[model samples]
Target: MKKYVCTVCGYEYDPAEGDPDNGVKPGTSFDDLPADWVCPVCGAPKSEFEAA
Candidate 1:
């Protein structure tokens, strides 16, 4: 699974359990992030997410 980390707050996103606020339920893939989804912690754009 791919791992994503938030650049602003160091929050980690597990591909096995996608971000809930992004409409990504558990067992969702990393690529499932919506185009308009923003980091829940820091409100950063998707471009701020980096591979962990």
Candidate 2:
């Protein structure tokens, strides 16, 4: 599993299985961000995320 952190708000997206907000579901990839996806907390681009 991978851990990611939001650059704008410093929110930690952990390696849990069912985080509806930032969890990467099965068969999903980091490159597959939803078209309307933005940081719910700080509105940062997905590209602003980095390994935590």
Candidate 3:
């Protein structure tokens, strides 16, 4: 599983520990997340994320 980072706030998205608060189930990959998913910390768009 790949990890992603928010370019705006450096928030790391770990697939092993998905953001359940945002409805992302555990082990969800970055690519599997909803298109509308944003940075949990900064609210940055999906386009603002990059492979970490």
Candidate 4:
């Protein structure tokens, strides 16, 4: 699984630990995130996250 880092504010998105507060179930990957996923810290769009 891949991990995504929010370039805007450095919020880390990990597949093994999805954001349940945002309705993202555990194990949900960066690629599986909603089409409109945004950074929880800065509200940046999906474009701000970089997979690594």
> Model 4 over residues 1-52: C-alpha lDDT tens digits?
7898999889889889898989999999888889877888889998878886
Per-residue lDDT of 1-52 in model 2, one digit per residue for the tens? 5667798899755545424655446545444657666666788887898988
Q: What TM-score would each prediction reach against the true structure? A: 0.79, 0.58, 0.93, 0.87
lDDT of 3 by residue, 1-52 (tens): 7988899999999999999998999999999999888898988998998999
Q: lDDT tens string, model 1, 1-52?
A: 8888889998887878677766788887656777787777888887988999
Off by over 4 Å in 3: none
Query: How displaced is residue 8 in candidate 4, in Å?
Result: 0.6
Distance from true location, Cα of 49 in model 3, Å: 0.8
Off by over 4 Å in 1: none
* Global lDDT of model 3: 0.92
Local error of candidate 4 at 33, Å?
0.7
Model 2 / residue 22 / CA error / Å: 8.0
Report the Cα RMSD per candidate: 1.4, 3.3, 0.7, 1.0
Clashes of each: 0, 0, 0, 0
lDDT rank, highest first?
3, 4, 1, 2
Candidates 2 and 4: which is better by TM-score?
Answer: 4
The total number of steric clashes, by the backbone 3 Å criterion, in model 1 comes to 0
Candidate 4 Cα RMSD after full superposition onto the native fold (Å): 1.0
Model 2, runs deviating above 4 Å? 15-33
CA error at residue 50 for candidate 4, angstroms: 0.8
